[PDB]
Design a protein around this ligand. Structure first.
Ligand SMILES: *[C@@H]1O[C@H](CO)[C@@H](O[C@@H]2O[C@H](CO)[C@@H](O)[C@H](O)[C@H]2NC(C)=O)[C@H](O)[C@H]1NC(C)=O
Ligand SMILES: *[C@@H]1O[C@H](CO)[C@@H](O[C@@H]2O[C@H](CO)[C@@H](O)[C@H](O)[C@H]2NC(C)=O)[C@H](O)[C@H]1NC(C)=O
Ligand SMILES: [Ca+2]
Ligand SMILES: [Ca+2]
Ligand SMILES: [Ca+2]
Ligand SMILES: [Ca+2]
Lengths: 233, 233
């Protein structure tokens, strides 16, 4: 009778006295063992957990706690040595990753089949981007080029910038990216990913430790006037 | 700032957002590792836990749960093979263990020095028992003898019967012995200990899975009129 009951990350459904479904913290050892280093995860305390399940099981007991509020999945994989974000790389990061977005969204559209990846309206949006003679092709471009393109193709970035935020705001969906939600942006694929944290600390204007839509958008150069919640969902 | 804050078994003090002490479930791996098999414990699922700390840490996440309400420390030590409680042994159990109490309490008084074991009034009580010509000496006695003594020395059992209950009602102190609190009575020392559960299921009159003082006392033959809470604390 808990089959339909989907408890959030870190918890599981156990029936209480009245045989009613209840969400309690999952036993970290009830999580499946990791297949390889790739299933492991690293917290922001530099402690490699066996898997995000294990991590979220552990972290579950800290709900409400000041310690818990701070406990976060830094990145997927085993805790690795992370190179300090050079002052240089940091200023060049926004441009580097903003382009990365447009290209990811493009390749998603190209890989999409019967909307398995992009919804209807989303595909339409990425379509206008995709088939535009002006669209700068993907490749390792000098920050200068990436910059001139941003001005010369600003409208081409408004959706990609908005999309990524939606893709991340899911733990839970509330319009804010926690340190954990930004974890995907710390994977090796991201350009100068070691700068992700440093950078996003730059975006966290009111320093609440959460990147909100306006901070995120504004951090990527998207005019506050061009921010649109409809583009996120 | 949690130093003074003593959370109950299974939980620990972690500060919440307002730097206020909060009681959250303890991380079972934060428990000290067991010294030897003797530090291990066995649950009623026949699963040997690393230590009561570990067990109570695990069980902590099940508060409220029907599964949790049933999760109990069966006995201290590793899960061993347990011999069935023969009908015979069951009827003879009350007499066997009631005597065991009087003798434990006596030897405690003899081993006491400056009240390290028995409080002041408690010693006085066990003293009147100890130095009484009529007191049946310790030894393996036929159930018949143990019986005749109970009638002939009833007053000599009222305190021992009450004391033991107090010694057990500690998780928490509420006047009820849970399956876990009765664990000490499942150790090898107790006479026909394998009959402990079976027996106490007999005492649990209103079948709530808890042995209350009246059930406990009455189960050992102590008159309902001779039950005294003052003798417990
Ligand atoms: C965080 O923990 C990781 C893993 O224990 C540390 O990474 C190691 O770093 C050293 C050099 O500092 C390298 O030689 C090792 O190869 C790294 N291990 C792995 C698995 O990559 C890291 O240094 C720690 N960082 C901090 C700030 O404590
Ligand atoms: C409960 O678990 C324990 C330990 O796994 C079992 O005890 C073993 O029992 C066998 C015979 O049944 C003995 O040969 C072993 O020596 C015992 N192990 C220990 C550590 O003493 C026990 O049988 C299980 N009981 C049930 C009902 O499942
Ligand atoms: Ca969020
Ligand atoms: Ca913020
Ligand atoms: Ca109790
Ligand atoms: Ca009862």
């Amino acid at each position: 009778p808990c089959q339909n009951h989907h408890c959030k990350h870190g918890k599981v459904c156990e029936l209480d006295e009245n045989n009613t479904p209840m969400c309690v913290c999952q036993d970290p050892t009830s999580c499946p063992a990791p297949i390889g280093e790739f299933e492991k995860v690293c917290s922001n305390d530099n402690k490699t957990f066996d898997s995000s399940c294990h991590f979220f099981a552990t972290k579950c007991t800290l709900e409400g706690t000041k310690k818990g509020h701070k406990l976060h999945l830094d990145y997927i994989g085993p805790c690795k040595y992370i190179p300090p974000c050079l002052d240089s790389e940091l200023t060049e990061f926004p441009l580097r990753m903003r382009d990365w977005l447009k290209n990811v969204l493009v390749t998603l559209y190209e890989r999409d089949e019967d909307n398995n990846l992009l919804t209807e309206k989303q595909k339409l949006r990425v379509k206008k981007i995709h088939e535009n003679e002006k669209r700068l092709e993907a490749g390792d471009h000098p920050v200068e080029l990436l910059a001139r393109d941003f001005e010369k193709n600003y409208n081409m970035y408004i959706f990609p910038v908005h999309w990524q935020f939606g893709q991340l705001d899911q733990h839970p969906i509330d319009g804010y990216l926690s340190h954990t939600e930004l974890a995907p942006l710390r994977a090796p694929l991201i350009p100068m990913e070691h700068c992700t944290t440093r950078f996003f600390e730059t975006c966290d204007l009111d320093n609440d430790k959460y990147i909100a839509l306006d901070e995120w958008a504004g951090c990527f150069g998207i005019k506050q006037k061009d921010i649109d919640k409809d583009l996120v969902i």
